Amino acid sequence: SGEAPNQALLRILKETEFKKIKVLGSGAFGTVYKGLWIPEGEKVKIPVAIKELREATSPKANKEILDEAYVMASVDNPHVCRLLGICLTSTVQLIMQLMPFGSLLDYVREHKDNIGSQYLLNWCVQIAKGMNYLEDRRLVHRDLAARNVLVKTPQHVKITDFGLAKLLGAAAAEYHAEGGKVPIKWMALESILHRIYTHQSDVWSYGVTVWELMTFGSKPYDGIPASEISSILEKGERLPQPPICTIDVYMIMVKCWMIDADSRPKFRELIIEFSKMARDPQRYLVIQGDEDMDDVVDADEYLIP
Numbered sequence: 001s002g003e004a005p006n007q008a009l010l011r012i013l014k015e016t017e018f019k020k021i022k023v024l025g026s027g028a029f030g031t032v033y034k035g036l037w038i039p040e041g042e043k044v045k046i047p048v049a050i051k052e053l054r055e056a057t058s059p060k061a062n063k064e065i066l067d068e069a070y071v072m073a074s075v076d077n078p079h080v081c082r083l084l085g086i087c088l089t090s091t092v093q094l095i096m097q098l099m100p101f102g103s104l105l106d107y108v109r110e111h112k113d114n115i116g117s118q119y120l121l122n123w124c125v126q127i128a129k130g131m132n133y134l135e136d137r138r139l140v141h142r143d144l145a146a147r148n149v150l151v152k153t154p155q156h157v158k159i160t161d162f163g164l165a166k167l168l169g170a171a172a173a174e175y176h177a178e179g180g181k182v183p184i185k186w187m188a189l190e191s192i193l194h195r196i197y198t199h200q201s202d203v204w205s206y207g208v209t210v211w212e213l214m215t216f217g218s219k220p221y222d223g224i225p226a227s228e229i230s231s232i233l234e235k236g237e238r239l240p241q242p243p244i245c246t247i248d249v250y251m252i253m254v255k256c257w258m259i260d261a262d263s264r265p266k267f268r269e270l271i272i273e274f275s276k277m278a279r280d281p282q283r284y285l286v287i288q289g290d291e292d293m294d295d296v297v298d299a300d301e302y303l304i305p
């Protein structure tokens with residue numbers, strides 16, 4: 001088979017037509033604001049998160065942030081984050097849909113007390129749906145983790161952070177990264193030793209991400225140096241069974257951690273198996289006692305021409 005053309009549109013916004021309101025976070029990436037976007041002459045107000053780079057004079061950053069805008073402009077799926085546009089000011093800044101509840105990792109940590117088994121299973125499904133879409137687009141995330149899942153509503157989550165994502169080239173099956181900084185606790189063994197990333201690499205990361213949710217935001221391999229992580233997997237060890245997981249749920253994430261990538265599950269299969277569990281959540285997770293804004297429009301209703 002061959003590759004089809006990518007007719008995704010990239011919209012360039014003016015600095016005048018959106019207003020920053022408050023700071024959500026700050027760091028090396030720059031600053032991320034909460035704001036409103038008002039397309040000129042369209043009579044809509046779209047709540048947005050705006051991110052501008054910290055330093056204007058950073059040539060590597062601008063090349064790397066435009067790479068993220070390229071990836072996000074090419075994806076349209078209910079469970080993958082939505083890019084609204086970019087602004088080419090002195091400090092380049094891109095505009096994304098606002099996810100009012102922050103990252104899913106912080107959410108389960110802040111609400112560990114009363115999260116039901118149905119939410120956890122539905123989240124597993126929705127994340128699998130996003131990842132199956134990226135596989136259909138020949139896109140490899142390479143950074144799937146609970147911290148990189150944003151929450152629109154408690155019943156609707158989305159995948160984000162494509163700073164490391166790569167589009168698998170035509171008639172290519174692996175990426176073969178040259179090198180760089182990476183999150184080791186979420187990486188498949190083949191990626192650790194050989195810098196090889198595939199769609200089955202992301203399935204491994206999916207297994208760890210599920211493990212973060214089932215443990216209510218616990219840190220994987222806590223206390224262990226990342227240096228010694230590789231030798232641990234080679235000797236056959238994995239992450240322990242979360243106390244709320246039945247054997248049925250734990251069996252699936254273990255399959256995500258087999259060294260032969262070809263024998264690991266595929267996102268299309270993970271959807272089905274978690275969809276089946278979501279029909280009766282309490283059979284598969286045993287949790288103690290689980291039983292002017294007039295013209296505002298959500299970004300998921302503001303479709304581009």
Ligand SMILES: COc1cc(N2CCC(N)CC2)ccc1Nc1ncc(C(=O)OC(C)C)c(-c2cn(C)c3ccccc23)n1
Nearest residue numbers: 024025026032049050051094096097098099100101102103
């Ligand atoms: C309400 O809204 C949010 C609030 C927060 N809490 C921050 C700390 C406390 N005040 C309590 C509330 C967190 C997130 C959001 N919503 C949101 N929506 C979209 C994005 C996004 O796609 O960012 C693009 C522009 C890069 C982000 C976001 C992504 N990254 C990497 C961040 C880093 C720091 C802060 C926010 C973000 N966040």
